[PDB]
């Protein structure tokens, strides 16, 4: 009976720690995944704007190459 009493309270601690553990990891996973996605969206946005600058350089260059 004493042995069982130990196994019960030990199971309570284990499950409690597992919940804290899984919650901590599940959160860190999301914040990491969110950081990658948002950055990749901003990164893509700038890349399309960078392509507009490159396009403008090609326009201005094309002008003087017709004179």
């Amino acid at each position: 009976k004493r042995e069982h009493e130990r196994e019960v309270i030990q199971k309570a601690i284990e499950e409690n720690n597992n919940f804290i553990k899984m919650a901590k990891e599940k959160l860190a996973q999301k914040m990491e995944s969110n950081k990658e996605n948002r950055e990749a969206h901003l990164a893509a946005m700038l890349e399309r704007l960078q392509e507009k600058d490159k396009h403008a350089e090609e326009v201005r260059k094309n002008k003087e190459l017709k004179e």
């Binding site: 409690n16 919940f19 804290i20 919650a23 901590k24 599940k26 959160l27 914040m31 995944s33 969110n34 950081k35 990658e36 996605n37 948002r38 969206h41």
Partner: protein, 440 residues
């Protein structure tokens, strides 16, 4: 001991916090500067009101509360309001940019920049507790902060405080006072994320509160001030057992034992009475039987639903004021033989009663009449799932076309989080359906 730390998130939570803490002060005879003449034990004490108020050596009674909002304009009013002396400047936390009605910004983009600070300030309160019982989290479903930041906080609290109890006072959205079209999205996302981390959540349907103010108080167009003053009374009734003591006083945790048959089934329906104007209450004494019978009028519920078309899993009655067990038992006996009250087969049908002889209190210049006795019924009905159903329907209409979804994806979220959350709500609706079915 057994202290309770209140956390007020977003505009709704903050402004309701003002109504609640203003109401608490009047009930405990605490002055706006924090002094409490009736309290002879200076600097500390183990009285009942100490569960919500800490004490300084200068005799100031300080709310065990934290106010958090990602923009300053709402909390700035607290910092310069009537009860500004009541709070230490560190209890009032603000950012510079709100979540813009976006769960993503409140939970990720903007929220992550202040979450560490908030948790530190909460820790400072918790370290003043000799036996912390748990947290009370006030927030809206609709807002970006109330939705996003709350769920982030609830998750972090589960890490920093393990299985320490965490209660919710959630403001269910209504079109009469809605602020955003995407509030259904924010509602589902928060409910999903917070579900595993909440032990008990009291939902407040703004439309329900809106209708009660129009109907019972004759307010043609209720403001947040009108709604909050009514809400604070229900909150006060629920927390009265923690803030006061008495012979027939039953602790909130005991009710919670009966109200939560399964972990996910932790959404009690609140019904308060009497809500009446000073004009009508004059020369009109509402007896125990009248206010108790009023708890079974769906027009008095905090959430719009029909318990008569559902099954009860629990029924608790939290009385306060001039009430004795005799009149209660008589009123209950009459109701049982006249109302559509039916329990599921796997639970007892006995009503659990608690009484706080401390009479109700009203804020100056309020619309609510001052009555000798009041009651708040906390029932666990399957009918509350109707609230989920209405929200989930509005969610599906927009998500089928992926409307406004880009605002969330742009902040880093994925469509998988939307579907994941919706499935959890579908399971929750199914759970409430399953508990109602008769046993084999």
């Amino acid at each position: 001991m057994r202290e309770c730390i209140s956390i007020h998130v977003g505009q709704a939570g903050v402004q309701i916090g003002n109504a609640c803490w203003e109401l608490y002060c009047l009930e405990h005879g605490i002055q706006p500067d924090g002094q409490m003449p009736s309290d002879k034990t200076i600097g500390g004490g183990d009285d009942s009101f100490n569960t919500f108020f800490s004490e300084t050596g200068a005799g100031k009674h300080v709310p065990r509360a934290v106010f958090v909002d990602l923009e300053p304009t709402v909390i700035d009013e607290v910092r310069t309001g009537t009860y500004r002396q009541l709070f230490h400047p560190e209890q009032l936390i603000t950012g510079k940019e709100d979540a813009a009605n976006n769960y993503a910004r409140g939970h990720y983009t903007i929220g992550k920049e202040i979450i560490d600070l908030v948790l530190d300030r909460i820790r400072k309160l918790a370290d003043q507790c000799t036996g912390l019982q748990g947290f009370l989290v006030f927030h809206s479903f609709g807002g970006g902060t109330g939705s996003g930041f709350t769920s982030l906080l609830m998750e972090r609290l589960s890490v920093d405080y393990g299985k320490k109890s965490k209660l919710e006072f959630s403001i269910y959205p209504a079109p009469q006072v809605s602020t955003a079209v995407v509030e259904p999205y924010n509602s589902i996302l928060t409910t999903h994320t917070t579900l595993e981390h909440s032990d008990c959540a009291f939902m407040v349907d703004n439309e329900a509160i809106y209708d009660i103010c129009r109907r019972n108080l004759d307010i043609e167009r209720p403001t947040y001030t009108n709604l909050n003053r009514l809400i604070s009374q229900i909150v006060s009734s629920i927390t009265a057992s923690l803030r006061f003591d008495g012979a027939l006083n039953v602790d909130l945790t005991e009710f919670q034992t009966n109200l939560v048959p399964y972990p996910r089934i932790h959404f009690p329906l609140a019904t308060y009475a009497p809500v009446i104007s000073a004009e009508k209450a004059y020369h009109e004494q509402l007896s125990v039987a009248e206010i108790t019978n009023a708890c079974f009028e769906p027009a008095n519920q905090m959430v719009k639903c029909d318990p008569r078309h559902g099954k009860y899993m629990a029924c608790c009655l939290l009385y306060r004021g001039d009430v004795v067990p005799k009149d209660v038992n008589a009123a209950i006996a009459t109701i049982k033989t006249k109302r559509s009250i039916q329990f599921v087969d796997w639970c007892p049908t006995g009503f659990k009663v608690g009484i706080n002889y401390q009479p109700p209190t009203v804020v100056p210049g309020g619309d609510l009449a001052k009555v000798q006795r009041a009651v708040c019924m906390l029932s666990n009905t399957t009918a509350i799932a109707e609230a989920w159903a209405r929200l989930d329907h509005k969610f599906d209409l927009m998500y089928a076309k992926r409307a406004f979804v880009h605002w969330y994806v742009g902040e880093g979220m994925e469509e998988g989080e939307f579907s994941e959350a919706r499935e959890d709500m579908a399971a929750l609706e199914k759970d409430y359906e399953e508990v109602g079915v008769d046993s084999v």
